[PDB]
Protein backbone atom coordinates (compact mmCIF):
# COMPACT_ATOMS: atom_id res chain seq x y z
CA UNK A 1 0.00 0.00 0.00
CA UNK A 2 1.31 3.45 -0.95
CA UNK A 3 -0.29 6.61 0.42
CA UNK A 4 0.68 10.13 -0.63
CA UNK A 5 -0.20 13.66 0.49
CA UNK A 6 1.30 17.05 1.37
CA UNK A 7 1.53 18.59 4.85
CA UNK A 8 3.27 21.34 6.79
CA UNK A 9 6.91 21.21 7.81
CA UNK A 10 6.25 21.01 11.56
CA UNK A 11 3.69 18.21 11.29
CA UNK A 12 5.87 15.47 9.74
CA UNK A 13 6.63 14.24 13.26
CA UNK A 14 2.91 13.52 13.71
CA UNK A 15 3.17 10.67 11.14
CA UNK A 16 4.27 7.95 13.55
CA UNK A 17 2.54 5.07 15.36
CA UNK A 18 0.98 6.05 18.67
CA UNK A 19 1.22 9.79 18.02
CA UNK A 20 -1.20 12.56 18.97
CA UNK A 21 -1.88 15.98 17.51
CA UNK A 22 -4.29 17.34 14.90
CA UNK A 23 -3.65 15.29 11.75
CA UNK A 24 -3.29 12.03 13.68
CA UNK A 25 -6.75 12.16 15.27
CA UNK A 26 -8.63 14.05 12.54
CA UNK A 27 -6.96 13.45 9.17
CA UNK A 28 -4.58 10.47 9.09
CA UNK A 29 -4.24 7.84 11.82
CA UNK A 30 -1.63 5.07 11.75
CA UNK A 31 -2.19 1.64 13.30
CA UNK A 32 -0.27 1.04 16.51
CA UNK A 33 1.41 -2.11 15.14
CA UNK A 34 2.10 -0.55 11.73
CA UNK A 35 4.90 -2.09 9.67
CA UNK A 36 6.44 -0.32 6.71
CA UNK A 37 8.27 2.91 5.97
CA UNK A 38 7.63 6.66 5.78
CA UNK A 39 9.35 9.05 3.36
CA UNK A 40 9.08 12.83 3.48
CA UNK A 41 10.87 15.53 1.52
CA UNK A 42 10.82 19.24 0.75
CA UNK A 43 8.64 20.61 -2.07
CA UNK A 44 8.81 24.33 -1.28
CA UNK A 45 10.11 25.23 -4.74
CA UNK A 46 7.24 23.41 -6.47
CA UNK A 47 4.17 24.02 -4.30
CA UNK A 48 4.69 27.65 -3.19
CA UNK A 49 3.73 30.81 -5.08
CA UNK A 50 4.55 34.46 -4.49
CA UNK B 1 21.43 51.34 -19.18
CA UNK B 2 20.24 48.10 -17.58
CA UNK B 3 22.38 46.18 -15.08
CA UNK B 4 21.50 42.75 -13.72
CA UNK B 5 22.89 40.44 -11.04
CA UNK B 6 21.93 38.20 -8.10
CA UNK B 7 22.67 38.98 -4.45
CA UNK B 8 21.83 37.76 -0.96
CA UNK B 9 18.38 38.51 0.39
CA UNK B 10 19.62 40.81 3.16
CA UNK B 11 21.86 42.93 0.89
CA UNK B 12 19.10 44.70 -1.07
CA UNK B 13 19.40 47.70 1.26
CA UNK B 14 23.06 48.12 0.24
CA UNK B 15 21.97 49.07 -3.31
CA UNK B 16 21.23 52.75 -2.70
CA UNK B 17 22.96 56.08 -3.43
CA UNK B 18 25.47 57.08 -0.78
CA UNK B 19 25.38 53.69 0.94
CA UNK B 20 28.21 51.74 2.58
CA UNK B 21 28.70 48.06 3.30
CA UNK B 22 30.57 45.17 1.67
CA UNK B 23 29.04 44.80 -1.80
CA UNK B 24 28.33 48.54 -1.95
CA UNK B 25 32.05 49.41 -1.86
CA UNK B 26 33.69 46.29 -3.36
CA UNK B 27 31.38 44.93 -6.09
CA UNK B 28 28.83 47.57 -7.12
CA UNK B 29 28.80 51.31 -6.38
CA UNK B 30 25.96 53.76 -6.99
CA UNK B 31 26.96 57.35 -7.83
CA UNK B 32 25.77 60.01 -5.40
CA UNK B 33 23.95 61.80 -8.26
CA UNK B 34 22.23 58.61 -9.43
CA UNK B 35 18.98 58.96 -11.36
CA UNK B 36 16.97 55.95 -12.40
CA UNK B 37 15.28 53.10 -10.59
CA UNK B 38 16.04 49.79 -8.87
CA UNK B 39 14.08 46.52 -9.01
CA UNK B 40 14.56 43.47 -6.80
CA UNK B 41 12.57 40.26 -6.53
CA UNK B 42 12.72 36.71 -5.19
CA UNK B 43 14.42 33.68 -6.74
CA UNK B 44 14.32 31.16 -3.90
CA UNK B 45 12.52 28.60 -6.07
CA UNK B 46 14.66 29.22 -9.16
CA UNK B 47 18.27 29.50 -7.94
CA UNK B 48 18.37 27.16 -4.93
CA UNK B 49 19.13 23.43 -4.97
CA UNK B 50 18.76 20.80 -2.26
PDB file of N, CA and C in Angstrom:
ATOM      1  N   UNK A   1       0.843  -1.188   0.000  1.00  0.00           N
ATOM      2  CA  UNK A   1       0.000   0.000   0.000  1.00  0.00           C
ATOM      3  C   UNK A   1       0.880   1.240   0.000  1.00  0.00           C
ATOM      4  N   UNK A   2       0.570   2.194  -0.878  1.00  0.00           N
ATOM      5  CA  UNK A   2       1.309   3.447  -0.953  1.00  0.00           C
ATOM      6  C   UNK A   2       0.331   4.599  -0.803  1.00  0.00           C
ATOM      7  N   UNK A   3       0.559   5.450   0.190  1.00  0.00           N
ATOM      8  CA  UNK A   3      -0.288   6.611   0.421  1.00  0.00           C
ATOM      9  C   UNK A   3       0.545   7.876   0.295  1.00  0.00           C
ATOM     10  N   UNK A   4      -0.030   8.892  -0.338  1.00  0.00           N
ATOM     11  CA  UNK A   4       0.676  10.129  -0.633  1.00  0.00           C
ATOM     12  C   UNK A   4      -0.189  11.327  -0.275  1.00  0.00           C
ATOM     13  N   UNK A   5       0.458  12.379   0.215  1.00  0.00           N
ATOM     14  CA  UNK A   5      -0.205  13.655   0.486  1.00  0.00           C
ATOM     15  C   UNK A   5       0.869  14.714   0.730  1.00  0.00           C
ATOM     16  N   UNK A   6       0.428  15.915   1.102  1.00  0.00           N
ATOM     17  CA  UNK A   6       1.303  17.052   1.366  1.00  0.00           C
ATOM     18  C   UNK A   6       0.855  17.701   2.668  1.00  0.00           C
ATOM     19  N   UNK A   7       1.815  18.024   3.536  1.00  0.00           N
ATOM     20  CA  UNK A   7       1.526  18.588   4.852  1.00  0.00           C
ATOM     21  C   UNK A   7       2.508  19.713   5.152  1.00  0.00           C
ATOM     22  N   UNK A   8       2.375  20.278   6.349  1.00  0.00           N
ATOM     23  CA  UNK A   8       3.267  21.338   6.790  1.00  0.00           C
ATOM     24  C   UNK A   8       4.602  20.762   7.255  1.00  0.00           C
ATOM     25  N   UNK A   9       5.593  21.645   7.382  1.00  0.00           N
ATOM     26  CA  UNK A   9       6.910  21.208   7.814  1.00  0.00           C
ATOM     27  C   UNK A   9       6.933  20.699   9.244  1.00  0.00           C
ATOM     28  N   UNK A  10       6.215  21.376  10.143  1.00  0.00           N
ATOM     29  CA  UNK A  10       6.247  21.006  11.556  1.00  0.00           C
ATOM     30  C   UNK A  10       5.593  19.651  11.800  1.00  0.00           C
ATOM     31  N   UNK A  11       4.610  19.291  10.982  1.00  0.00           N
ATOM     32  CA  UNK A  11       3.688  18.209  11.288  1.00  0.00           C
ATOM     33  C   UNK A  11       4.180  16.840  10.830  1.00  0.00           C
ATOM     34  N   UNK A  12       5.355  16.764  10.199  1.00  0.00           N
ATOM     35  CA  UNK A  12       5.865  15.474   9.740  1.00  0.00           C
ATOM     36  C   UNK A  12       6.099  14.533  10.913  1.00  0.00           C
ATOM     37  N   UNK A  13       6.435  15.077  12.084  1.00  0.00           N
ATOM     38  CA  UNK A  13       6.629  14.243  13.262  1.00  0.00           C
ATOM     39  C   UNK A  13       5.335  13.592  13.728  1.00  0.00           C
ATOM     40  N   UNK A  14       4.180  14.127  13.328  1.00  0.00           N
ATOM     41  CA  UNK A  14       2.912  13.517  13.706  1.00  0.00           C
ATOM     42  C   UNK A  14       2.638  12.215  12.967  1.00  0.00           C
ATOM     43  N   UNK A  15       3.377  11.918  11.902  1.00  0.00           N
ATOM     44  CA  UNK A  15       3.168  10.674  11.142  1.00  0.00           C
ATOM     45  C   UNK A  15       4.071   9.628  11.783  1.00  0.00           C
ATOM     46  N   UNK A  16       3.553   9.000  12.836  1.00  0.00           N
ATOM     47  CA  UNK A  16       4.266   7.952  13.553  1.00  0.00           C
ATOM     48  C   UNK A  16       3.255   7.161  14.362  1.00  0.00           C
ATOM     49  N   UNK A  17       3.479   5.863  14.565  1.00  0.00           N
ATOM     50  CA  UNK A  17       2.536   5.072  15.362  1.00  0.00           C
ATOM     51  C   UNK A  17       2.429   5.607  16.782  1.00  0.00           C
ATOM     52  N   UNK A  18       1.213   5.576  17.317  1.00  0.00           N
ATOM     53  CA  UNK A  18       0.983   6.047  18.674  1.00  0.00           C
ATOM     54  C   UNK A  18       1.320   7.507  18.883  1.00  0.00           C
ATOM     55  N   UNK A  19       0.955   8.362  17.933  1.00  0.00           N
ATOM     56  CA  UNK A  19       1.218   9.790  18.022  1.00  0.00           C
ATOM     57  C   UNK A  19      -0.092  10.555  18.120  1.00  0.00           C
ATOM     58  N   UNK A  20      -0.036  11.710  18.777  1.00  0.00           N
ATOM     59  CA  UNK A  20      -1.202  12.556  18.973  1.00  0.00           C
ATOM     60  C   UNK A  20      -0.921  13.951  18.438  1.00  0.00           C
ATOM     61  N   UNK A  21      -1.989  14.644  18.057  1.00  0.00           N
ATOM     62  CA  UNK A  21      -1.880  15.979  17.506  1.00  0.00           C
ATOM     63  C   UNK A  21      -3.180  16.441  16.883  1.00  0.00           C
ATOM     64  N   UNK A  22      -3.109  16.943  15.654  1.00  0.00           N
ATOM     65  CA  UNK A  22      -4.289  17.338  14.897  1.00  0.00           C
ATOM     66  C   UNK A  22      -4.536  16.441  13.695  1.00  0.00           C
ATOM     67  N   UNK A  23      -3.499  16.169  12.902  1.00  0.00           N
ATOM     68  CA  UNK A  23      -3.650  15.288  11.749  1.00  0.00           C
ATOM     69  C   UNK A  23      -3.906  13.858  12.201  1.00  0.00           C
ATOM     70  N   UNK A  24      -3.222  13.424  13.262  1.00  0.00           N
ATOM     71  CA  UNK A  24      -3.291  12.026  13.676  1.00  0.00           C
ATOM     72  C   UNK A  24      -4.710  11.622  14.055  1.00  0.00           C
ATOM     73  N   UNK A  25      -5.427  12.490  14.762  1.00  0.00           N
ATOM     74  CA  UNK A  25      -6.751  12.163  15.272  1.00  0.00           C
ATOM     75  C   UNK A  25      -7.880  12.760  14.440  1.00  0.00           C
ATOM     76  N   UNK A  26      -7.570  13.457  13.347  1.00  0.00           N
ATOM     77  CA  UNK A  26      -8.630  14.050  12.541  1.00  0.00           C
ATOM     78  C   UNK A  26      -8.462  13.779  11.051  1.00  0.00           C
ATOM     79  N   UNK A  27      -7.229  13.575  10.595  1.00  0.00           N
ATOM     80  CA  UNK A  27      -6.963  13.452   9.167  1.00  0.00           C
ATOM     81  C   UNK A  27      -6.344  12.119   8.782  1.00  0.00           C
ATOM     82  N   UNK A  28      -5.293  11.686   9.474  1.00  0.00           N
ATOM     83  CA  UNK A  28      -4.583  10.471   9.090  1.00  0.00           C
ATOM     84  C   UNK A  28      -4.067   9.783  10.342  1.00  0.00           C
ATOM     85  N   UNK A  29      -4.605   8.602  10.635  1.00  0.00           N
ATOM     86  CA  UNK A  29      -4.237   7.839  11.818  1.00  0.00           C
ATOM     87  C   UNK A  29      -3.540   6.555  11.397  1.00  0.00           C
ATOM     88  N   UNK A  30      -2.401   6.274  12.020  1.00  0.00           N
ATOM     89  CA  UNK A  30      -1.629   5.072  11.745  1.00  0.00           C
ATOM     90  C   UNK A  30      -1.946   3.986  12.763  1.00  0.00           C
ATOM     91  N   UNK A  31      -2.001   2.727  12.337  1.00  0.00           N
ATOM     92  CA  UNK A  31      -2.185   1.637  13.299  1.00  0.00           C
ATOM     93  C   UNK A  31      -1.006   1.541  14.251  1.00  0.00           C
ATOM     94  N   UNK A  32      -1.299   1.103  15.477  1.00  0.00           N
ATOM     95  CA  UNK A  32      -0.268   1.044  16.507  1.00  0.00           C
ATOM     96  C   UNK A  32       0.832   0.056  16.137  1.00  0.00           C
ATOM     97  N   UNK A  33       0.461  -1.085  15.557  1.00  0.00           N
ATOM     98  CA  UNK A  33       1.414  -2.108  15.144  1.00  0.00           C
ATOM     99  C   UNK A  33       1.790  -1.984  13.672  1.00  0.00           C
ATOM    100  N   UNK A  34       1.808  -0.760  13.146  1.00  0.00           N
ATOM    101  CA  UNK A  34       2.097  -0.550  11.734  1.00  0.00           C
ATOM    102  C   UNK A  34       3.497  -1.039  11.386  1.00  0.00           C
ATOM    103  N   UNK A  35       3.616  -1.661  10.217  1.00  0.00           N
ATOM    104  CA  UNK A  35       4.899  -2.085   9.674  1.00  0.00           C
ATOM    105  C   UNK A  35       5.045  -1.515   8.272  1.00  0.00           C
ATOM    106  N   UNK A  36       6.202  -0.954   7.988  1.00  0.00           N
ATOM    107  CA  UNK A  36       6.444  -0.318   6.711  1.00  0.00           C
ATOM    108  C   UNK A  36       7.455   0.805   6.868  1.00  0.00           C
ATOM    109  N   UNK A  37       7.340   1.798   5.988  1.00  0.00           N
ATOM    110  CA  UNK A  37       8.274   2.915   5.969  1.00  0.00           C
ATOM    111  C   UNK A  37       7.536   4.209   5.659  1.00  0.00           C
ATOM    112  N   UNK A  38       8.152   5.324   6.047  1.00  0.00           N
ATOM    113  CA  UNK A  38       7.630   6.658   5.782  1.00  0.00           C
ATOM    114  C   UNK A  38       8.743   7.499   5.168  1.00  0.00           C
ATOM    115  N   UNK A  39       8.417   8.199   4.081  1.00  0.00           N
ATOM    116  CA  UNK A  39       9.352   9.046   3.356  1.00  0.00           C
ATOM    117  C   UNK A  39       8.740  10.434   3.269  1.00  0.00           C
ATOM    118  N   UNK A  40       9.538  11.454   3.564  1.00  0.00           N
ATOM    119  CA  UNK A  40       9.084  12.833   3.476  1.00  0.00           C
ATOM    120  C   UNK A  40      10.210  13.689   2.923  1.00  0.00           C
ATOM    121  N   UNK A  41       9.859  14.647   2.071  1.00  0.00           N
ATOM    122  CA  UNK A  41      10.875  15.532   1.517  1.00  0.00           C
ATOM    123  C   UNK A  41      10.286  16.913   1.272  1.00  0.00           C
ATOM    124  N   UNK A  42      11.165  17.838   0.894  1.00  0.00           N
ATOM    125  CA  UNK A  42      10.820  19.245   0.746  1.00  0.00           C
ATOM    126  C   UNK A  42      10.349  19.529  -0.674  1.00  0.00           C
ATOM    127  N   UNK A  43       9.206  20.201  -0.788  1.00  0.00           N
ATOM    128  CA  UNK A  43       8.639  20.609  -2.068  1.00  0.00           C
ATOM    129  C   UNK A  43       8.281  22.087  -2.049  1.00  0.00           C
ATOM    130  N   UNK A  44       9.086  22.895  -1.356  1.00  0.00           N
ATOM    131  CA  UNK A  44       8.806  24.326  -1.277  1.00  0.00           C
ATOM    132  C   UNK A  44       8.893  24.986  -2.648  1.00  0.00           C
ATOM    133  N   UNK A  45       9.887  24.611  -3.447  1.00  0.00           N
ATOM    134  CA  UNK A  45      10.114  25.234  -4.744  1.00  0.00           C
ATOM    135  C   UNK A  45       9.188  24.707  -5.834  1.00  0.00           C
ATOM    136  N   UNK A  46       8.154  23.947  -5.478  1.00  0.00           N
ATOM    137  CA  UNK A  46       7.236  23.409  -6.474  1.00  0.00           C
ATOM    138  C   UNK A  46       5.786  23.673  -6.089  1.00  0.00           C
ATOM    139  N   UNK A  47       5.528  23.880  -4.800  1.00  0.00           N
ATOM    140  CA  UNK A  47       4.169  24.023  -4.295  1.00  0.00           C
ATOM    141  C   UNK A  47       3.903  25.389  -3.676  1.00  0.00           C
ATOM    142  N   UNK A  48       4.843  26.324  -3.774  1.00  0.00           N
ATOM    143  CA  UNK A  48       4.689  27.649  -3.192  1.00  0.00           C
ATOM    144  C   UNK A  48       4.704  28.706  -4.285  1.00  0.00           C
ATOM    145  N   UNK A  49       3.822  29.692  -4.151  1.00  0.00           N
ATOM    146  CA  UNK A  49       3.726  30.807  -5.080  1.00  0.00           C
ATOM    147  C   UNK A  49       3.943  32.116  -4.333  1.00  0.00           C
ATOM    148  N   UNK A  50       4.293  33.158  -5.092  1.00  0.00           N
ATOM    149  CA  UNK A  50       4.553  34.465  -4.489  1.00  0.00           C
ATOM    150  C   UNK A  50       3.303  34.990  -3.791  1.00  0.00           C
TER     151      UNK A  50
ATOM    152  N   UNK B   1      20.562  52.415 -19.634  1.00  0.00           N
ATOM    153  CA  UNK B   1      21.432  51.337 -19.182  1.00  0.00           C
ATOM    154  C   UNK B   1      20.674  50.406 -18.250  1.00  0.00           C
ATOM    155  N   UNK B   2      20.867  49.099 -18.431  1.00  0.00           N
ATOM    156  CA  UNK B   2      20.242  48.095 -17.579  1.00  0.00           C
ATOM    157  C   UNK B   2      21.322  47.171 -17.040  1.00  0.00           C
ATOM    158  N   UNK B   3      21.408  47.057 -15.719  1.00  0.00           N
ATOM    159  CA  UNK B   3      22.380  46.180 -15.083  1.00  0.00           C
ATOM    160  C   UNK B   3      21.652  45.120 -14.272  1.00  0.00           C
ATOM    161  N   UNK B   4      22.145  43.888 -14.343  1.00  0.00           N
ATOM    162  CA  UNK B   4      21.496  42.748 -13.716  1.00  0.00           C
ATOM    163  C   UNK B   4      22.514  41.918 -12.950  1.00  0.00           C
ATOM    164  N   UNK B   5      22.083  41.380 -11.811  1.00  0.00           N
ATOM    165  CA  UNK B   5      22.890  40.438 -11.040  1.00  0.00           C
ATOM    166  C   UNK B   5      21.992  39.766 -10.005  1.00  0.00           C
ATOM    167  N   UNK B   6      22.613  38.943  -9.159  1.00  0.00           N
ATOM    168  CA  UNK B   6      21.931  38.204  -8.103  1.00  0.00           C
ATOM    169  C   UNK B   6      22.722  38.384  -6.816  1.00  0.00           C
ATOM    170  N   UNK B   7      22.026  38.714  -5.727  1.00  0.00           N
ATOM    171  CA  UNK B   7      22.669  38.980  -4.447  1.00  0.00           C
ATOM    172  C   UNK B   7      21.897  38.283  -3.334  1.00  0.00           C
ATOM    173  N   UNK B   8      22.483  38.309  -2.138  1.00  0.00           N
ATOM    174  CA  UNK B   8      21.831  37.760  -0.960  1.00  0.00           C
ATOM    175  C   UNK B   8      20.566  38.547  -0.632  1.00  0.00           C
ATOM    176  N   UNK B   9      19.648  37.882   0.070  1.00  0.00           N
ATOM    177  CA  UNK B   9      18.377  38.509   0.391  1.00  0.00           C
ATOM    178  C   UNK B   9      18.508  39.734   1.274  1.00  0.00           C
ATOM    179  N   UNK B  10      19.462  39.721   2.203  1.00  0.00           N
ATOM    180  CA  UNK B  10      19.621  40.809   3.158  1.00  0.00           C
ATOM    181  C   UNK B  10      20.343  42.021   2.578  1.00  0.00           C
ATOM    182  N   UNK B  11      20.983  41.886   1.420  1.00  0.00           N
ATOM    183  CA  UNK B  11      21.856  42.927   0.894  1.00  0.00           C
ATOM    184  C   UNK B  11      21.138  43.940   0.012  1.00  0.00           C
ATOM    185  N   UNK B  12      19.823  43.803  -0.177  1.00  0.00           N
ATOM    186  CA  UNK B  12      19.103  44.703  -1.074  1.00  0.00           C
ATOM    187  C   UNK B  12      19.163  46.141  -0.579  1.00  0.00           C
ATOM    188  N   UNK B  13      19.292  46.343   0.734  1.00  0.00           N
ATOM    189  CA  UNK B  13      19.404  47.698   1.257  1.00  0.00           C
ATOM    190  C   UNK B  13      20.727  48.351   0.884  1.00  0.00           C
ATOM    191  N   UNK B  14      21.764  47.561   0.607  1.00  0.00           N
ATOM    192  CA  UNK B  14      23.061  48.117   0.242  1.00  0.00           C
ATOM    193  C   UNK B  14      23.083  48.716  -1.157  1.00  0.00           C
ATOM    194  N   UNK B  15      22.049  48.487  -1.966  1.00  0.00           N
ATOM    195  CA  UNK B  15      21.971  49.071  -3.305  1.00  0.00           C
ATOM    196  C   UNK B  15      21.157  50.354  -3.163  1.00  0.00           C
ATOM    197  N   UNK B  16      21.857  51.452  -2.881  1.00  0.00           N
ATOM    198  CA  UNK B  16      21.232  52.755  -2.700  1.00  0.00           C
ATOM    199  C   UNK B  16      22.305  53.818  -2.843  1.00  0.00           C
ATOM    200  N   UNK B  17      21.958  55.007  -3.334  1.00  0.00           N
ATOM    201  CA  UNK B  17      22.958  56.078  -3.434  1.00  0.00           C
ATOM    202  C   UNK B  17      23.505  56.447  -2.064  1.00  0.00           C
ATOM    203  N   UNK B  18      24.811  56.703  -2.016  1.00  0.00           N
ATOM    204  CA  UNK B  18      25.467  57.084  -0.781  1.00  0.00           C
ATOM    205  C   UNK B  18      25.330  56.055   0.322  1.00  0.00           C
ATOM    206  N   UNK B  19      25.519  54.783  -0.015  1.00  0.00           N
ATOM    207  CA  UNK B  19      25.385  53.694   0.938  1.00  0.00           C
ATOM    208  C   UNK B  19      26.716  52.968   1.075  1.00  0.00           C
ATOM    209  N   UNK B  20      26.965  52.434   2.270  1.00  0.00           N
ATOM    210  CA  UNK B  20      28.208  51.744   2.577  1.00  0.00           C
ATOM    211  C   UNK B  20      27.908  50.351   3.108  1.00  0.00           C
ATOM    212  N   UNK B  21      28.852  49.440   2.885  1.00  0.00           N
ATOM    213  CA  UNK B  21      28.702  48.060   3.300  1.00  0.00           C
ATOM    214  C   UNK B  21      29.859  47.201   2.834  1.00  0.00           C
ATOM    215  N   UNK B  22      29.555  46.042   2.253  1.00  0.00           N
ATOM    216  CA  UNK B  22      30.566  45.173   1.665  1.00  0.00           C
ATOM    217  C   UNK B  22      30.442  45.114   0.149  1.00  0.00           C
ATOM    218  N   UNK B  23      29.262  44.764  -0.364  1.00  0.00           N
ATOM    219  CA  UNK B  23      29.040  44.798  -1.804  1.00  0.00           C
ATOM    220  C   UNK B  23      29.043  46.235  -2.308  1.00  0.00           C
ATOM    221  N   UNK B  24      28.497  47.158  -1.511  1.00  0.00           N
ATOM    222  CA  UNK B  24      28.331  48.538  -1.948  1.00  0.00           C
ATOM    223  C   UNK B  24      29.653  49.234  -2.239  1.00  0.00           C
ATOM    224  N   UNK B  25      30.761  48.761  -1.663  1.00  0.00           N
ATOM    225  CA  UNK B  25      32.053  49.407  -1.856  1.00  0.00           C
ATOM    226  C   UNK B  25      33.111  48.465  -2.416  1.00  0.00           C
ATOM    227  N   UNK B  26      32.743  47.240  -2.787  1.00  0.00           N
ATOM    228  CA  UNK B  26      33.693  46.294  -3.360  1.00  0.00           C
ATOM    229  C   UNK B  26      33.215  45.627  -4.638  1.00  0.00           C
ATOM    230  N   UNK B  27      31.910  45.566  -4.891  1.00  0.00           N
ATOM    231  CA  UNK B  27      31.380  44.929  -6.090  1.00  0.00           C
ATOM    232  C   UNK B  27      30.590  45.890  -6.962  1.00  0.00           C
ATOM    233  N   UNK B  28      29.672  46.654  -6.374  1.00  0.00           N
ATOM    234  CA  UNK B  28      28.830  47.575  -7.123  1.00  0.00           C
ATOM    235  C   UNK B  28      28.687  48.866  -6.337  1.00  0.00           C
ATOM    236  N   UNK B  29      28.886  49.997  -7.011  1.00  0.00           N
ATOM    237  CA  UNK B  29      28.805  51.306  -6.377  1.00  0.00           C
ATOM    238  C   UNK B  29      27.836  52.188  -7.148  1.00  0.00           C
ATOM    239  N   UNK B  30      26.927  52.836  -6.422  1.00  0.00           N
ATOM    240  CA  UNK B  30      25.958  53.764  -6.988  1.00  0.00           C
ATOM    241  C   UNK B  30      26.461  55.190  -6.851  1.00  0.00           C
ATOM    242  N   UNK B  31      26.512  55.960  -7.938  1.00  0.00           N
ATOM    243  CA  UNK B  31      26.959  57.353  -7.830  1.00  0.00           C
ATOM    244  C   UNK B  31      26.009  58.169  -6.967  1.00  0.00           C
ATOM    245  N   UNK B  32      26.566  59.185  -6.307  1.00  0.00           N
ATOM    246  CA  UNK B  32      25.768  60.008  -5.404  1.00  0.00           C
ATOM    247  C   UNK B  32      24.695  60.791  -6.150  1.00  0.00           C
ATOM    248  N   UNK B  33      24.923  61.096  -7.428  1.00  0.00           N
ATOM    249  CA  UNK B  33      23.952  61.797  -8.259  1.00  0.00           C
ATOM    250  C   UNK B  33      23.140  60.839  -9.123  1.00  0.00           C
ATOM    251  N   UNK B  34      22.908  59.623  -8.636  1.00  0.00           N
ATOM    252  CA  UNK B  34      22.229  58.611  -9.431  1.00  0.00           C
ATOM    253  C   UNK B  34      20.790  59.017  -9.718  1.00  0.00           C
ATOM    254  N   UNK B  35      20.374  58.834 -10.966  1.00  0.00           N
ATOM    255  CA  UNK B  35      18.981  58.963 -11.363  1.00  0.00           C
ATOM    256  C   UNK B  35      18.588  57.710 -12.128  1.00  0.00           C
ATOM    257  N   UNK B  36      17.399  57.216 -11.857  1.00  0.00           N
ATOM    258  CA  UNK B  36      16.971  55.947 -12.402  1.00  0.00           C
ATOM    259  C   UNK B  36      16.091  55.222 -11.398  1.00  0.00           C
ATOM    260  N   UNK B  37      16.160  53.894 -11.434  1.00  0.00           N
ATOM    261  CA  UNK B  37      15.281  53.099 -10.588  1.00  0.00           C
ATOM    262  C   UNK B  37      15.933  51.744 -10.340  1.00  0.00           C
ATOM    263  N   UNK B  38      15.489  51.071  -9.278  1.00  0.00           N
ATOM    264  CA  UNK B  38      16.043  49.787  -8.870  1.00  0.00           C
ATOM    265  C   UNK B  38      14.902  48.809  -8.612  1.00  0.00           C
ATOM    266  N   UNK B  39      15.087  47.571  -9.072  1.00  0.00           N
ATOM    267  CA  UNK B  39      14.084  46.519  -9.005  1.00  0.00           C
ATOM    268  C   UNK B  39      14.741  45.296  -8.387  1.00  0.00           C
ATOM    269  N   UNK B  40      14.064  44.679  -7.424  1.00  0.00           N
ATOM    270  CA  UNK B  40      14.564  43.466  -6.795  1.00  0.00           C
ATOM    271  C   UNK B  40      13.403  42.523  -6.530  1.00  0.00           C
ATOM    272  N   UNK B  41      13.615  41.234  -6.780  1.00  0.00           N
ATOM    273  CA  UNK B  41      12.567  40.255  -6.529  1.00  0.00           C
ATOM    274  C   UNK B  41      13.193  38.923  -6.134  1.00  0.00           C
ATOM    275  N   UNK B  42      12.327  37.958  -5.830  1.00  0.00           N
ATOM    276  CA  UNK B  42      12.720  36.713  -5.187  1.00  0.00           C
ATOM    277  C   UNK B  42      13.028  35.631  -6.212  1.00  0.00           C
ATOM    278  N   UNK B  43      14.023  34.804  -5.897  1.00  0.00           N
ATOM    279  CA  UNK B  43      14.417  33.683  -6.743  1.00  0.00           C
ATOM    280  C   UNK B  43      14.763  32.471  -5.892  1.00  0.00           C
ATOM    281  N   UNK B  44      14.061  32.305  -4.767  1.00  0.00           N
ATOM    282  CA  UNK B  44      14.323  31.163  -3.896  1.00  0.00           C
ATOM    283  C   UNK B  44      14.016  29.849  -4.602  1.00  0.00           C
ATOM    284  N   UNK B  45      12.943  29.813  -5.384  1.00  0.00           N
ATOM    285  CA  UNK B  45      12.517  28.600  -6.065  1.00  0.00           C
ATOM    286  C   UNK B  45      13.078  28.482  -7.477  1.00  0.00           C
ATOM    287  N   UNK B  46      14.072  29.296  -7.833  1.00  0.00           N
ATOM    288  CA  UNK B  46      14.664  29.223  -9.163  1.00  0.00           C
ATOM    289  C   UNK B  46      16.171  29.016  -9.095  1.00  0.00           C
ATOM    290  N   UNK B  47      16.812  29.534  -8.047  1.00  0.00           N
ATOM    291  CA  UNK B  47      18.266  29.504  -7.942  1.00  0.00           C
ATOM    292  C   UNK B  47      18.746  28.833  -6.660  1.00  0.00           C
ATOM    293  N   UNK B  48      17.982  27.881  -6.129  1.00  0.00           N
ATOM    294  CA  UNK B  48      18.369  27.155  -4.927  1.00  0.00           C
ATOM    295  C   UNK B  48      18.156  25.666  -5.147  1.00  0.00           C
ATOM    296  N   UNK B  49      19.185  24.876  -4.856  1.00  0.00           N
ATOM    297  CA  UNK B  49      19.131  23.427  -4.969  1.00  0.00           C
ATOM    298  C   UNK B  49      19.186  22.789  -3.588  1.00  0.00           C
ATOM    299  N   UNK B  50      18.726  21.537  -3.519  1.00  0.00           N
ATOM    300  CA  UNK B  50      18.757  20.802  -2.257  1.00  0.00           C
ATOM    301  C   UNK B  50      20.195  20.585  -1.806  1.00  0.00           C
TER     302      UNK B  50
END
